[model samples]
Every structure is written in structure tokens, then in C-alpha cells.
Target: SDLGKKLLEAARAGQDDEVRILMANGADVNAKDEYGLTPLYLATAHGHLEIVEVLLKNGADVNAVDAIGFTPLHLAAFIGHLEIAEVLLKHGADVNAQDKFGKTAFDISIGNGNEDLAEILQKL
Candidate 1:
């Protein structure tokens, strides 16, 4: 439990070294917080590129949705994190995954006026 908490905190803070150490010690890569947010969700939502890559490499679910049905890709696109969104895409995240409100990652990017993100999402 302590390791899980530390893993979540380190992920939230984007502490790459701490996250790596905790995960190496057997922390769950897909552990969710009270909000049903996984470590991958925290890393992606916070734009922690290194943490996102690490979590993905460690087997974090590329399409894991939170309580509201927002995946890491959705969070990245909504926050306008192009690189993070690309990482999720490269890892095979569902581009068409919709939230409870029926909003896809592409929908969020377009709604946010991220033309570049929209273009990229459109191609995928």
C-alpha cells in the first residue's frame, strides 16, 4: 500500500526517478487513485512525457479510462499535449474512444482549436 501510494504521488509530481524506483520494487503500473485515475492518466494529464513513456513501457494500459471514461490519450489531447498524445497513439490507444459525454480525443482536440492535434488525430 505504501509503495502504491508513493507510486501514485511520484506519478502525480512527475518524479521520474521515484516512479522508476517504486515500479522496480513491484508497484502496480495500473494502480488507480480514488478518482479512478491510473498512474498513466496522471502522467499524461500532467504532461509528464518521461513518466508516460516509462509507464507505457512498464505495461500501463494504453486505453485505460477513468471514472468519467477519459483515457490517457483523451487527457493529453484535452490538455493540448501533442507529444504525449502521440506517445499514446504510438502505443495503440483507441483514437475513437469516447467519454461518458461521447467526446473522443479528436473531438477534444478540435474543440480546443488544436488544429495540429486534429490533423494528427485525423490521420490516425
Candidate 2:
């Protein structure tokens, strides 16, 4: 389980190399941390593009929801990370995926008064 812990920690810390090594060694890309956050969620939440790319390439579930039903796209939109959002969308993220509150990334962006972000989601 050290690999799982290490992979989660490295991803949370944005250490791309360490994350890559741990994942390459068979760490679960979809493994959830105590908070029910997957590596893809952490990377996207923190705007770690490299780590996000690595995790997705390694087969991380793009639409994997956490305990709160927040997917990687939800985190990206909530945090207003356009690049992360774009990457996730490019990888087939579900734009219409809803959270526990029945809110999608578009709803989050609109609720946050992020017109530009909402516009991007709107076009989807």
C-alpha cells in the first residue's frame, strides 16, 4: 500500500516524476485517498497539468466521482483551471456529469459567476 500512498502523495504534491514512477510500478491511477479523491482529482484540483496528463494516459477514470460525487471535470471547473478542464474534455470527460447536488461543471461555473468558464462549458 506504500505505492498507493506514495502515488497519492506525489500527485497531491505535484511531483510529476515521482507520480510517474509510482504509477509505472503498478500504482492504481484510480485509487482514492482518505478523502475519496483519486489521483486525477488531486492533479486537476491543483492544476498539475503534467500529473493529470500522466494519470489519464495511465488509464485513470476521467469521470470517476469522489465521495461527494465530484469528478475531475467538476474539480477543474470549480477551481477555474481552464487548461485542466480542456485536457479533461479532450480525454472524453462527461460535460453533463452531475455531482451529488445534481450540478454539472457548467452549473458550478455559472454559479461562481465565471462567465468565460460558463461560456466554454456552454459550447460543449
Candidate 3:
């Protein structure tokens, strides 16, 4: 269980190399914290692009929602990261998925003034 917590710690405060190290040591990629935040979720929340990609490539669920129903796609859009949103989309995230507040990632992007990001999402 310590390895699981380390996975989250690396994602939150370290680099992708540490994340990969934890993973290689048998940490579950999908392990969630007490608050229901997985490594992917924490990685995305903290803007660790490399860590996010590492987790995704290592079998993290791109569309896994948190306790409040926000997927990684939603977090990417909500945080105004155009590149991150694009990566999540390429990994099969639902652009049209609604969160607990009934808002899609595209809608969140638009509301968040992510016009550039919204452009790519609108076409998909």
C-alpha cells in the first residue's frame, strides 16, 4: 500500500521518471487515494504532462471519473490545457460526457475561455 501512495505522490510532486519507477516496482496504475483521486487524476490536476502520459500508457483509464464525476478530460478542459485535452481525446475520452454538474468538457472549455482548446473539441 505504500507503493500505491508513492505513485500518487510522484504524480503530484515529482517527475515522470519517479512515476515510472513506482510503476515498475509493482504499483497499481489505477490506485485511488482516500478521496478517490487516482494517479492519473492527480497527475492531470497538477499539470504533470509527462506523468499523465506515463500513467495513460501504463494502462490508466483516461475516462475514469472522480467522486464528483469529473473525468481526466474534464479536468484537462477545466484547467485550460489544450494540449492535455487533445491527448486525452486521442486516448478515447468522451468529449460529450457530462459531469455531475451536467457540463461536458467542451462546455467547460467554452466557459473557461479556452477558445483554442474548444476549437479542436468542436470538430470531433
- Choose 1 or 2, whichever is better by lDDT: 1
Q: Residue-wise lDDT of candidate 3 within 1-124, one digit each (tens)?
A: 6888888888889477889898788888988888888888888888788888888878888878987689998898888877777778878889889999899988988999989888888999
Best of the candidates, lDDT: 1
Q: Between candidates 2 and 3, which one is better according to TM-score? A: 3
Off by over 4 Å in 3: none
lDDT of 1 by residue, 1-124 (tens): 6787888999999899999998789898888788887899998888899999988888899878887888888888888998998888988999999999999999989998888888899998
lDDT of 2: 0.87
lDDT tens digits by residue: candidate 2, 1-124 = 6788898899889999999899779997888788877889888888999999888888889988888788898888888888788888889999999999999999988887777778888999
Report lDDT (CA) for all predictions: 0.89, 0.87, 0.85
Give the clash total for candidate 1.
Answer: 0
- List the candidates ranked by TM-score, beginning with the highest: 1, 3, 2
What TM-score do all the candidates reach, one by one?
0.94, 0.91, 0.93
**Ranking of candidates on lDDT, top first:** 1, 2, 3
lDDT of 2 at 73: 87
Model 2 scores worst on lDDT over the 10 consecutive residues at: 111-120
